[PDB]
Ligand SMILES: O[C@@H]1[C@@H](O)[C@H](O[C@@H]2CO[C@@H](O[C@@H]3CO[C@@H](O)[C@H](O)[C@H]3O)[C@H](O)[C@H]2O)OC[C@H]1O
């Protein structure tokens with residue numbers, strides 16, 4: 523299954539991330555800045571079907587249970603958000619996509635002077651699919667990423683040709699909580 527472990531924090535607050543056995547990981551976090559922790563693949567694919575089971579999902583603040591990855595050419599950070607805490611992420615509304623039993627809202631946002639895979643202070647577009655209501659957790663779940671890639675394409679949101687990592691993540695900003703996720 524997975525071959526990659528992602529564990530990044532801007533150093534704000536506490537992010538206690540555990541690289542577990544196989545595709546399993548856990549995070550306990552408190553009063554954070556920006557962070558992203560997850561398991562997945564060093565090289566993303568628009569054709570990948572990601573499976574996971576979030577045995578524990580207990581955010582608050584801005585904390586997302588999300589497919590997370592990058593492309594370059596152009597530099598794009600993308601999300602397929604299945605669940606969240608207190609605040610649901612949104613941006614510029616494009617449309618919707620139905621996939622894996624859920625309806626997701628498609629949004630774009632822009633990050634300025636921000637950390638990325640390309641450096642400490644960079645500018646990049648973010649693509650989002652955000653589930654309309656929180657996905658149930660604790661059972662096996664699939665994200666059929668091709669559905670999202672295709673839907674994004676239809677709204678002129680094209681991904682880059684150079685694929686970086688792709689993980690099923692716990693990601694947050696000004697957030698506290700616990701997660702435990704297995705990815706395959
Ligand atoms: O090979 C695949 C298996 O790995 C997959 O097994 C699932 C693995 O995740 C299990 O859920 C965990 C239970 O413990 C909690 O603490 C964790 O947070 C959960 O992730 C789940 O029960 C298994 O079915 O099944 C499909 C195979 O293809």
Ligand SMILES: O[C@@H]1[C@@H](O)[C@H](O[C@@H]2CO[C@@H](O[C@@H]3CO[C@@H](O)[C@H](O)[C@H]3O)[C@H](O)[C@H]2O)OC[C@H]1O
Pocket residue numbers: 530556557558599633636637638639640641693694695
């Ligand atoms: O040397 C490089 C690493 O430092 C680099 O780490 C990336 C730093 O940017 C992170 O993106 C932020 C994640 O949090 C989100 O909320 C924000 O949108 C982003 O600013 C990214 O997760 C890290 O991978 O990785 C590549 C190395 O070359």
